[PDB]
Amino acid sequence: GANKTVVVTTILESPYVMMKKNHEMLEGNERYEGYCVDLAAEIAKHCGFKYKLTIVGDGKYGARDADTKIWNGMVGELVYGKADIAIAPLTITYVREEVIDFSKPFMSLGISIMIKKGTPIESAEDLSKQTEIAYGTLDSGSTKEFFRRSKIAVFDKMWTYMRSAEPSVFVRTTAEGVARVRKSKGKYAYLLESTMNEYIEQRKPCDTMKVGGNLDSKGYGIATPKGSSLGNAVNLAVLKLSEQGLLDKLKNKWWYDKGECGS
Amino acid sequence: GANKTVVVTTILESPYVMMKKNHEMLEGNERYEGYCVDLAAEIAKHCGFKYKLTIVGDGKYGARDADTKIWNGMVGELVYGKADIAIAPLTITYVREEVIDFSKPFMSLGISIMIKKGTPIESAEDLSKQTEIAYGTLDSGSTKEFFRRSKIAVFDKMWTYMRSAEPSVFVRTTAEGVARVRKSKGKYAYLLESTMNEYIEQRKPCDTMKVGGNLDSKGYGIATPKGSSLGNAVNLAVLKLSEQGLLDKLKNKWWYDKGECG
Ligand SMILES: CN1CNS(=O)(=O)c2ccc(CCc3ccc4c(c3)N(C)CNS4(=O)=O)cc21
Ligand SMILES: N[C@@H](CCC(=O)O)C(=O)O
Ligand SMILES: N[C@@H](CCC(=O)O)C(=O)O
Ligand SMILES: [Cl-]
Ligand SMILES: [Zn+2]
Ligand SMILES: [Zn+2]
Ligand SMILES: [Zn+2]
Ligand SMILES: [Zn+2]
Ligand SMILES: [Zn+2]
Ligand SMILES: [Zn+2]
Ligand SMILES: [Zn+2]
Ligand SMILES: [Zn+2]
Ligand SMILES: [Zn+2]
Ligand SMILES: [Zn+2]
Ligand SMILES: [Zn+2]
Ligand SMILES: [Zn+2]
Ligand SMILES: [Zn+2]
Ligand SMILES: [Zn+2]
Ligand SMILES: [Zn+2]
Numbered sequence: 001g002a003n004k005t006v007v008v009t010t011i012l013e014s015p016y017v018m019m020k021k022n023h024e025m026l027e028g029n030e031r032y033e034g035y036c037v038d039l040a041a042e043i044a045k046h047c048g049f050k051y052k053l054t055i056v057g058d059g060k061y062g063a064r065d066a067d068t069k070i071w072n073g074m075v076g077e078l079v080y081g082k083a084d085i086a087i088a089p090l091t092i093t094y095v096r097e098e099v100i101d102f103s104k105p106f107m108s109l110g111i112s113i114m115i116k117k118g119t120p121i122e123s124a125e126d127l128s129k130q131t132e133i134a135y136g137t138l139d140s141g142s143t144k145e146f147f148r149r150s151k152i153a154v155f156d157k158m159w160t161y162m163r164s165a166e167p168s169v170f171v172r173t174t175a176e177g178v179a180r181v182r183k184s185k186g187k188y189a190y191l192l193e194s195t196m197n198e199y200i201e202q203r204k205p206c207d208t209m210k211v212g213g214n215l216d217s218k219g220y221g222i223a224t225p226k227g228s229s230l231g232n233a234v235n236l237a238v239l240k241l242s243e244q245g246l247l248d249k250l251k252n253k254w255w256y257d258k259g260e261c262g263s
Numbered sequence: 264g265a266n267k268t269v270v271v272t273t274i275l276e277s278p279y280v281m282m283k284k285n286h287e288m289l290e291g292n293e294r295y296e297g298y299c300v301d302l303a304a305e306i307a308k309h310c311g312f313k314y315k316l317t318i319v320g321d322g323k324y325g326a327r328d329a330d331t332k333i334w335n336g337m338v339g340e341l342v343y344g345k346a347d348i349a350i351a352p353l354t355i356t357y358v359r360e361e362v363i364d365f366s367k368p369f370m371s372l373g374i375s376i377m378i379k380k381g382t383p384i385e386s387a388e389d390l391s392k393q394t395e396i397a398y399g400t401l402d403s404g405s406t407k408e409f410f411r412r413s414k415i416a417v418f419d420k421m422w423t424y425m426r427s428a429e430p431s432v433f434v435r436t437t438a439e440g441v442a443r444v445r446k447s448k449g450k451y452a453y454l455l456e457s458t459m460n461e462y463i464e465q466r467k468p469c470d471t472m473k474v475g476g477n478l479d480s481k482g483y484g485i486a487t488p489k490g491s492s493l494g495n496a497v498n499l500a501v502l503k504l505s506e507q508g509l510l511d512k513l514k515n516k517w518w519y520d521k522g523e524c525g
Pocket of ligand 3: 324
């Protein structure tokens, strides 16, 4: 039938999507800015659709409740038909690929360690062999699931600690984890994706640091409900923009051109 | 219908697929070893099929002839039905995605610069601003197409030089490019994927070096003919192997555990 406006689900996560300082004087898609706002405009132009950005109602990425088997977050909005596409830093994972479709990745990343500068930690092994410094992850995301499922000795030891730590070492948002690092005088380290870690490293007050190599290698993809007619075009659009260098330009724009910790 | 042995097309490219030292007394899949031989075995086990490794007839990855529009290499073997799956360091690209299916990537890479140690080159910009040191790429692959299509000033300038340089700066195989670097006393630099560059850096005689950052960011995928019934399972198998750490284990096995340069 007639063309319909595509409902995009996304998440308030810097620098991917944020509200403009003057958002109350703006309308619709113009209220937002960031890497994924820029990417959404390009995907829509190349695939030939109009769209509406919406922020995921529960503020989560997406996980399946073991008891109810209900998906939450952006994944849930696609699974239950509340959104037509997700354009966000949404990690491609096996369990998600079983229930939604993903484009080829638009950004590479791996799990990484964020410390407050001066913390005597250089690696995941370092974290796993000590107890003075607490550490945790985001809730309802792919990093928590990585540790929950890992059979690698170091990462399983970390999970055994994190799942039982009291008070909870897990946080509701990336911003909460960063704030916990910054206020803990070196006694909390945060496990988060290298993309978000590298962004925060270039933000005032310039007191955090990414240390060690990444723990895994994966990517973010644009997600659609399984079998959606948009998937083929969106996948080709990602590859076209990748090959033309747009994805590299956008990363530089939102990570480094606007960095606050020097050149 | 009944299960059929899956025909795998792949390519002799170290350390992905190589003939074993004792290959002349071996038969079938046992003749070969490497990262992609191990990966094929894992994919087959998780997807539940038997398979036969075959080396692509023309020794190429795959490009489309501009005049006839016919695909060569492994891509062609999939397009024309000569193979059921390609398990190789085959780069995911737009033009290929139009004619074959790719899994999610099993390895990350980008285009990179290989020099003979001591060559006064640190970047693509350095190459583009001089003429004493020649440089080129593999034929019939994704790196040549990258330069052919780039509108980035430095890379467009490099393509203008490469497309007309005499003698030809292009090579038919990665091994020919590496040999050209090693024998040119620093007057040839080779543009190739970072995976292959980093492998060669750890091989005797330890006289090459990867320099500069990568020029792009992309990945290798397992490829199937469009609409093949194997595609969905193979894609999930790649993600499972990724999440289990198996892909990382295999890279360490074939790049670094037996590196020869310390
Ligand atoms: C940014 N970009 C443009 N798109 S593309 O040419 O398809 C492409 C392919 C691969 C990567 C390297 C980073 C990565 C992303 C995703 C995964 C990985 C590894 N591996 C290694 C396991 N598989 S995965 O899909 O989680 C980046 C990339
Ligand atoms: N990108 C992650 C969220 C961040 C994290 O888990 O570290 C996801 O899609 O679940
Ligand atoms: N991996 C490349 C071949 C190597 C190259 O072009 O540098 C391809 O799939 O074409
Ligand atoms: Cl058979
Ligand atoms: Zn506000
Ligand atoms: Zn209002
Ligand atoms: Zn565009
Ligand atoms: Zn929504
Ligand atoms: Zn240590
Ligand atoms: Zn103390
Ligand atoms: Zn355990
Ligand atoms: Zn202090
Ligand atoms: Zn600030
Ligand atoms: Zn760093
Ligand atoms: Zn296995
Ligand atoms: Zn040109
Ligand atoms: Zn000399
Ligand atoms: Zn040798
Ligand atoms: Zn190096």
